[PDB]
Amino acid sequence: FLDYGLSEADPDVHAIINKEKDRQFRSLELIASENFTSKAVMEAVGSCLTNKYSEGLPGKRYYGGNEHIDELEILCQQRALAAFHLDGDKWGVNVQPLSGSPANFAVYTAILKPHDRIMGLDLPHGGHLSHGFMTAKRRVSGTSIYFESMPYRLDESTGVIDYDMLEKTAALFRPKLIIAGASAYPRDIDYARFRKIADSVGAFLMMDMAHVSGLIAASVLADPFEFVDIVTTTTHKSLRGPRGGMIFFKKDAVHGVDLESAINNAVFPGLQGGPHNHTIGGLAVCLKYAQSPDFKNYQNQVVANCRALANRLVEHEYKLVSGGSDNHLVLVDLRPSGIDGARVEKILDMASITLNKNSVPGDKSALVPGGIRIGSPAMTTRGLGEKEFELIADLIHEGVRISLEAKSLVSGTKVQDFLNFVLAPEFPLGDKVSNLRRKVEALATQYPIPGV
Amino acid sequence: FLDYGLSEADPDVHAIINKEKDRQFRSLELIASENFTSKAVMEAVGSCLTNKYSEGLPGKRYYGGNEHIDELEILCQQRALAAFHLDGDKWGVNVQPLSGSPANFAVYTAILKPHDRIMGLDLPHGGHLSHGFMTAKRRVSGTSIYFESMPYRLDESTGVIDYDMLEKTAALFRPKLIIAGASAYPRDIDYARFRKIADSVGAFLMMDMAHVSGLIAASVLADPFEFVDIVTTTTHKSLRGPRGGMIFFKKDAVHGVDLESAINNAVFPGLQGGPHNHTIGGLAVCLKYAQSPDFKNYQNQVVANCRALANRLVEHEYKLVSGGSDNHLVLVDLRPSGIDGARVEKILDMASITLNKNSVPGDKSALVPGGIRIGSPAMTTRGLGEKEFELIADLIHEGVRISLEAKSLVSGTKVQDFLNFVLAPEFPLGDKVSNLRRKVEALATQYPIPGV
Amino acid sequence: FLDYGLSEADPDVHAIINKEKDRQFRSLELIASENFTSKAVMEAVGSCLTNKYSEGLPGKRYYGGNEHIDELEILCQQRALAAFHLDGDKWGVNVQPLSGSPANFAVYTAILKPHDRIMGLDLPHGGHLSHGFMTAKRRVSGTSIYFESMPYRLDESTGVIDYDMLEKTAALFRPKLIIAGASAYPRDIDYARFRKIADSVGAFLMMDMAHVSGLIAASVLADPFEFVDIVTTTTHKSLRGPRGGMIFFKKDAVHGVDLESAINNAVFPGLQGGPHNHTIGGLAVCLKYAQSPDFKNYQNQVVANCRALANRLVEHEYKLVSGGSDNHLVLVDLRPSGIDGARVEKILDMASITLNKNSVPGDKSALVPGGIRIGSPAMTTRGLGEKEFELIADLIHEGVRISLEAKSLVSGTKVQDFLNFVLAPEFPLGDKVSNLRRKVEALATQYPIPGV
Amino acid sequence: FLDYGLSEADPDVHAIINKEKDRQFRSLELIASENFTSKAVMEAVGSCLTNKYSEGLPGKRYYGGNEHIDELEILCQQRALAAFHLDGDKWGVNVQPLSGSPANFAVYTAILKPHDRIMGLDLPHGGHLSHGFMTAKRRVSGTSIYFESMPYRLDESTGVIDYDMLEKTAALFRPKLIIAGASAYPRDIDYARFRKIADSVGAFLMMDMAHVSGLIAASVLADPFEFVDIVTTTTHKSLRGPRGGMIFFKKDAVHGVDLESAINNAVFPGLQGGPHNHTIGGLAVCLKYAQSPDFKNYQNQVVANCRALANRLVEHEYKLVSGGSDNHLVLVDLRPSGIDGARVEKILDMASITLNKNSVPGDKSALVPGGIRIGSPAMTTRGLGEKEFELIADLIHEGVRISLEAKSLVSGTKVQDFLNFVLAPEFPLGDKVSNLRRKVEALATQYPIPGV
């Protein structure tokens, strides 16, 4: 019998994990969908819970030996409801979805028939692929393959959801399901208006709270559970848990449908097999923490840090999509600054500032993203405050200046020409990038980081 | 800053995990889809890899900061190919699927249009729900909602796939995709015959090797890659890795279709979002082990142990479906013994023997399965040999005798009647169950268990 | 062998036809979709052409004996092209559709896949039901069952197609097909604007000219063939042919599609069997006449007569949707007059004036149509001129006044209670209706009626 | 205005009808689906009923109105029920379908959802295309586009429907609708066995009696109304009416569905616009005649004539599919004679014998049909008896002999080369064809032909 540790069993994987750990510690991790989960969550996820098959629901399993798995799943469900301040007679929860996308697809499967109509926020306006996405030449999202999705849009001149136009187009298109929630929407959502619009056409109403779940849990943002029928979420991002998903649903019939029975059946036996109990373990851990005063303080700090960063970017004369943010993220419209997000993302990454390019309202080309998305959750977890997020803004500004300089110096007009130029060993702004990286890492490495 | 460990942060979850670890340790785990993953796999799965967003493929991501994630995913893909002895110019692999069910649904999304025709082994005859399942009342599986599935069946008198009838029904139904592979099939599959049948109608041909992947990697069973276009698998079960999935595909065009592009696009952006890099890390670890001489020895012992158990059960005059097994599992037809699998499963579980009820070909009641499925992988991993599996058969036989005695003594005629009776504190065979449990636990606890 | 004439073979059917001759002679037929076909058409329709099976296309049939049927179909195609002034190198035609709805469904089948998206004018705004129609809880049109339809609407303040809103909703919905044409639209269509909008989303563009085909043939209205890809039509309404349909199509590839082969294959073998050669014979007859100067004079009289009626109704203080008409019909909004179209239709019918109740923009419910649709083609065929159409307006006005008086005598608010009151044998406005009927019949019986 | 007769209005169309009348008079019309309708039917179809409006789109249901009452339609319905010996409390009928194929499609639309499963007799084994047909390359029938069709087949050794295999394949495929009836099946149908099989999967059961309706009305063949839920038919073929269709249905709920409401709504407004009252007029006329003793004698003569022909063809050493016929047609397997149906059909057409090439069970390709379909109804209508049908068999045999001689003179295998050879002005078997044609026409012209 041999059961070596990772350093003994697999030096290459061990080494790679160590490099990634090294990278996380010294980088400014500004991806709005990333966080740093706890040592406790990691210990539950890296446990023997992975070994068990438990298809079905607690007390209602296909296989034997599930006494402790059932205790865990019941505990996890109770903590999910408690974290979002829900009465268990009004709301149920399924904690088995493997991720945010499968959670959404299970909802669609539960309440819609194939080719039924869905409306969600348009992808280039801050939406998520799983709410539907079609190009001129293909159905890109599985949502747009199996269902008939039509987007609603921001007023491109403002960067806020055009509720009046949604009202008009919903009346014409007659969706069965309207989805609120977004991947890159910097403002809070008018949930009352979504309800009015859904009722106008007898639609189901869902909130995908993946990006804002912890802010909702901490009552920093408005509560979608006051207005919607169904709520989906990832358990990573805002909630700072393991990689997984959850679906919350009203237990009272909605449009004559028992959502509990429909959603549970869609998850299993509909779409998934055995639950990932190791993940469910981690989720229960994170949901306990979600109820704590420290988590509430953390989420308020998230929004204060994003505000500090936004204000300083604006002082450097950047334009923000929608003019600001009410949440954990900001979208910088780089077009007025004379550059795009693809170019800026690469230079910033080379200096250990990690974020992503993001499309901006008005972008001519989907293949050239006009902006960058920046989030505060991950570095807020590490204990950075408002002053440090102002420094982050200055470091970003320095990075964008380097990117602008690199753009002018590259002869080629194409994004790929920019990439070849910056990655070449004769790249002439290497020392400016190193100087920036030195400052970035000098900030990041002053702070602890959670994990095993 | 506070980053307590699990015992400190969440005593309730910590205690549950300890109880589950110990239950696994003192039980005979005979669920054919269960195994005990390694310490090294758990270490990778419980690492900081969980923190990274990396939508896309290596070298082509939608976020910064992916240097090390890309190294890991490339390593994982190259190990997957090596474990199955595949030339990378002819075979590709996607290691992102979240589990076996999403792996399969991604394949269907890649190569089929909604409502295209699929044939898989019937669920009551050892098939998996993800290959399609409909009752008289409804479409149960997502596969049967979004696609048009029609089963192929065993010859009910032999328990072997009725290849002649599949030939005839494929010619009539004209499936776009034929699926080989099963959850509870005790024999090797005639892949050459599947290729003949697929070609007769121009169908794509897939193998779902979830239950047999390790046996294939070790060359104990026949290689499906000699005959099929696409192979899907869970990474847990036979491969003894983390909970996840993989899809392998030919890189030469099949029926005019670029499978690489189709399958990769179906996984992302089609159906999933960010890959679970912690799982991918664990997968890379298990795929290294899968190539080792010890893994080959293990897989040969799995088959030898199943054979030792089967033969001893036959000495106790149990009937096996198909007359035996070529693999890691056996199906006991309990009907001639005068009992069903639902009843036997529960008593065995009370005695710390975990297996599952299973439908037998010819079962009249879908609700009341006539058999049990027993697998050797998990206890083989702990180091049990043929003598010990012979003792397992005796203990099972002892449990079935208790179950028969229990079935006789309960007045109630339904399964739920049997359950209430066996769980009553005045249950008259409790001492027989406890005595059996002592013997079971006295055997199990002689062997170590892997994991952290 | 006996082959009696109808009067001997079937006295009851002969009697029914004689009654119908009487009804046609005595009545003012103002149903905008009705007309009177010629004796010559009727003699072709009532011939031995009905005996022949001729599946396929001329010179390419699946039945022998089709030399003369081939002759006829080619002649019919030649005449259809000449009647609409079309270059046969640029346009083809299929003359086999059995009616307008199946003609439209054949087009959809040819160029779309099931559940592809279609936009047509909303039924309650005077659209054709076969362009798509769904209520709050059912898909009523087959078009809306098999395809995904979303309407476009009139500007309610002008009664004209809201082209600006169509431009916006098309961009969001992304129809594969946009349909122009209407059952109750009193204006010509901006084909250039439809082309612009279609091109903005890469849609096919079709005109359904069923109601206006003769006006188009006579160059009274704009030519859709200057801008659209596909034109469908009935043969009975405006062309004064037999009951049937035709589909015209570009012969140059449109969006990579050979419309000729696609359309021909959808008609047969896709949706229909053997062509109705008696109908095709009658159609050929009417298409000869459609080229004549007298047909052109007739179509100009149609519009002049509608103008005369429209102007006199406005003198009687009726509101017309869109303030008038460019074509053969008026849509009268009766809401300001204090009564609905269902009550008025019935009273007018009792007085031998046949027309249709019709929804009007701004109506709350389809159950209470606010208007009546009135058309000049049928009575223009009989020889009525502008002065006689002014007299018709006066007669309609008398009928509306009787309806208002009747309404005041009915206790209920339900349309059924009105119907019961006005049909009751002692209905106290019987003398008024009788007096109006005498005026109506005294106008009608001054004019002959074509036919055998 | 003018109202010229056809000879004056359109001498070209008049000349074509003159030619077709002569062709019908001079030829042996042996197409099994053809017949000669009566003068009385033609007089009704060629009447002012074409200008009658009964109902039109959008229809009374749209406005929430009552059932439309029409004297001619009611008469037609009463006569249809009477002709088939049906109790009107148990059966209803819709007489509005425009032909057989749209009648069938309306049934599917009424009782099925898109992509629901249908089984019908395979096209190459004598099925009808509207029951479903797909090649390896494409969905040819609209039925197979909008629904999921799977065929059932004949036992190729007997030429009879393989009821045992249908039982098996229905249990696997689980159709929602099973269709009985055929275009080229020479035997009666075991309706009791279809009912048994339909009930085994909870399927609706329909009979398409288009080819055999008159034999059913006359009690020559078994009554499908004893067993099925729905019966469709053409009105032209066996009933000898105008070109049209009908749908009969049970009035008691079937599988919880009100068939009356469903079917009526699918026909109109679902799939068609207003009824064709001229056709309904002709239908009423033929349904009166269908109740007469003379019609019953006629239908018995149809069977006797087919038997005389069949027996004489066997004397000439032709093989008949199924070894004979119970009905109005025979399917001759020409493979033992060394020639295909396409070549034979052509030569026979040249000698004024009109019939159809037809696939034979066991043919390798649909591109080379192995047989010919020959029917007695049309020439039976003209007054031919058994002796004359024996002469017809002799004349067919002469034409087959000519075809074989022609085949030997042609260089190569391509049917086009055969066609060019036989149509060449100096075709060297022209005198043999002319001598046969003279015999054919000398027989045909002894008999009158019905019609105006």
Numbering used by the authors:
A (entry chain B), B (entry chain A), C (entry chain C), D (entry chain D): 82 to 533
Give the exact sentences the study uses for this entry.
SHMTs are α-class pyridoxal 5′-phosphate (PLP)-dependent enzymes which transfer hydroxymethyl of Ser to – typically polyglutamylated (polyGlu) – tetrahydrofolate (H4PteGlun), producing Gly and 5,10-CH2-H4PteGlun. Here we report crystal structures of a chloroplastic SHMT enzyme from the model legume plant, Medicago truncatula (Mt), which similarly to At has seven SHMT isoforms. MtSHMT3 is a member of the α-class of PLP enzymes, and its overall fold is typical for this family. A subunit of MtSHMT3 can be subdivided into three regions: N-terminal arm, large domain, and small domain, consistently with other SHMTs.
